[model samples]
Target: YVNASNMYGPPQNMSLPPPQTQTIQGTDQPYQYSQCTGRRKALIIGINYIGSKNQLRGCINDAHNIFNFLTNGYGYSSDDIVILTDDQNDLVRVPTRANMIRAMQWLVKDAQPNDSLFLHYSGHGGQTDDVIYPVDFETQGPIIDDEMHDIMVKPLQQGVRLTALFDSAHSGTVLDLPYTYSTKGIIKEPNIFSAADVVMLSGSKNTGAMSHAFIKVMTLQPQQSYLSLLQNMRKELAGKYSQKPQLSSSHPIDVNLQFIM
Candidate 1:
């Protein structure tokens, strides 16, 4: 995920269960279930704004590039991806707590037992209790390390390989840690097995530069390798915030998966 400012807050600051009426009564029952037996699917999720009327422009680019990279480069089919664009659907696209649940439900309903489900986010990311926010989950809810592990990470732990590339700050905190809650270096949490087998790739550190020169890299440095891309990001971040930028990913990510520009 890559571009949230105001919406990125500690999980404790969130407003749980939402404010709507009909939703207030449904907590007693489970969300409706749908079935997908044998099909590949993806959730191209993004959120650009926060509060009531935040603006969004990141998800479109992220989804477009990732969808193409997967289909054309990685052999996935056109029908396999779901682009939940915030274009005209302004109400459901805000990356709020409610919107995030809807997106996950959509994906789960469409995915089959053996089908591989891919989740790609390119908006904002951060941590308070040393955990990062996956896309759609807002800073208002109490979605902590345990909550995230069960809801997002643990779901696909069996046979799925979920690759997450985060272009925002505090992104590394998503995985359980040795990365602890410290601001020093990467932490790793071994006790918590993810909802699924996940690989999170991030752009910077907890307090590192908010934005990157990825767009610049594409225009100015065409042949740069992954490590070089990270180095350049670090340089820009260091100049802006005077701290080093860190780029990393969870172990076991499909080494063959290509990244976006």
Candidate 2:
């Protein structure tokens, strides 16, 4: 149940049908489900591009804030989270392309069925000629969509849960996970990879709008299903923000299971 006082918008009037077991488009693969009762871990990245002209406000704050929310609100431990901010003194903790990739690998390393993993990035994002980009602008390169998907989503076991939040522009489908869903639980696209399970919440060109509403709604209703939560976030930001948020997955989801942080 959600605490009404903490809710971000009007109560949802929408209700979703029981999730269907859909076959993956290109193969004989059927979507697998997760209970999200296993180990929980997170990797959060926020880049301020400190010395560069591209520096933006609130990214560092967003990272730290989310870190606190996970530990305080969700019971995730500090020992289980890895934070990377440009201001960190450790070279390995900076949001350079290589370090970002390394952290992503670390985030999903040794994941098993029902293991709940999370990744959040707050930084500048863009598109290269052929790739969706999450930029570490001050460090010299961008982390491409394909690279991120491979590192964070591909290596997990079947039924493992990997949830991500991308609070950057042009980050929609940045994980390139194939299946994207609408608020009505309709399939927007058909993609592959049946063994590993992933769900990505990405911001479009509008920066913090989506993730902001997402966190607020989740704070109130941490047990809400993916479709309902997404729809509620969409409703929360409907007229206030320009760019829409998106929900995408590596495999078709059941949407009945509570989204783990």
Candidate 3:
């Protein structure tokens, strides 16, 4: 039940500085950078699927740790974050599919430009061989990227930022965002949206190693560009882990810019 739009930071300053002209060659749609000077909210979910054979040890721990990190490090009020874990007795707070959807809806409700929202999930991801459905799906019971986009992402206005972290298998593109980027900050395709207010960090492409590593690195390092931070994590993940980290955005991003939390 954390819901407070406590205003923070400097006065309204809308800066839509375009990425390098050469960077986004195909699209004429203008992209704007968020000031991150408005309300902040978050929704965090972790499911061990307790009672099932698929129970995981680290997911609940991850949810608690992430909750603490956001409140302690980022000035996010606890009232603004909704946490769902299977260990809880209250059914509403548990990570059931219906509750997950409800939580997601709450997260994006009344979203406005400059408002910064965050979502983090740590649990089992899923897939399907059915030709009609997408293979890349994150679990909490069949919550696919399309549902995620339709529920939480597409409703927000331009310049509103939604930062997501998914610590599960097949989570790389769970949000189905169009512009995927390389460690070098290069977009994979041209003619995409100018800028999407959403940014996602996937645990693995194939992928929890990422979630743990990201928290560790961010905790130790001073604030840096979003691109640089991810690059460092990617580099660390390259040799040590089988699952490579993935970053995708709703639209093309300027990796050089300061990453707004």
Candidate 4:
């Protein structure tokens, strides 16, 4: 039963714009961009692999620093974040392979469209067999990229947005995401499209090179867009780091649009 609908829906004061006839580029299906309007969750792993053959002075501090920055600077909550560090006496929270896998499951567990998820692995990264060594890698095997794609990636739905940072030793294709973009909005690689929007950054170092550069841009600028964010890092990173940074994605993105955390 309908009484009477509103004669006019709502009020608006705007200019008349010819908002039609936009380009139709590429054969790929129109993809989804995460509103980041749903639940926000993150898994930050900082494995120092302490008291061992290789020890990083940065890993633990990096994760802790990231937690503080994300919580204080950005909107990420400490309650929802899972931090896996080797220094923790708690074995369940240790950054072991099993725990890493467990973390992936946890990250993707209750994911929904527009839910923003993040994973940052700042530890030992190497292999072509390209692998990241977890805390128990001496006991178990390394974390494989294809396997990573299967767990943290493939299981994801259409609009869930996952942003990752692999800041350790040099890691190549650690997530096997199909597309890659440059700081200048150039397509450096290929894509088949998966619908889930993932931004994967892989490089040699963390605090100095990746995460710190990221937050520095976000904090120092305070007002940021996706294009400017990456643009800022390219200059800082290229000038300072021997590590060549790579920005890979599961899908193509329009850097022209405004970007948010």
Top candidate by TM-score: 4
Off by over 4 Å in 4: 1-30, 204-208
50-144: candidate 3 lDDT, tens digit per residue: 66755577888888888988898887798999998888788778877777888899998998777889999888776551011111123423766
Model 4 / residue 188 / CA error / Å: 2.8
Model 2 lDDT tens row, 221-246: 66576766776787778788875667
Model 3 regions lying over 4 Å from their true place: 1-28, 129-141, 184-187, 190-196, 205-207, 238-240
Taking the candidates one at a time, how many backbone clashes does each contain? 29, 0, 3, 1
Tell me model 3's lDDT, rounded to 2 decimals.
0.69
Ranking by TM-score: 4, 2, 3, 1
TM-score of each: 0.51, 0.83, 0.81, 0.84
lDDT, each prediction: 0.44, 0.71, 0.69, 0.71
In model 4, residue pairs whose N, Cα or C atoms come closer than 3 Å (at least 3 residues apart or on different chains), thus clashing, are: 127-130
- Measure candidate 1: CA RMSD: 14.4
- What is the lDDT, from 0 to 100, of the residue 44 in candidate 3? 89
Better by lDDT, candidate 3 or 2: 2
Q: After superposition, how far is residue 179 of candidate 3 from its true place, in Å?
A: 0.9
**Which residue pairs clash in candidate 3?**
2-79, 3-79, 204-207
Q: Tell me the TM-score of model 3.
A: 0.81
Q: Alpha carbon lDDT of residue 85, candidate 3?
A: 85
Candidate 4 TM-score, C-alpha based: 0.84
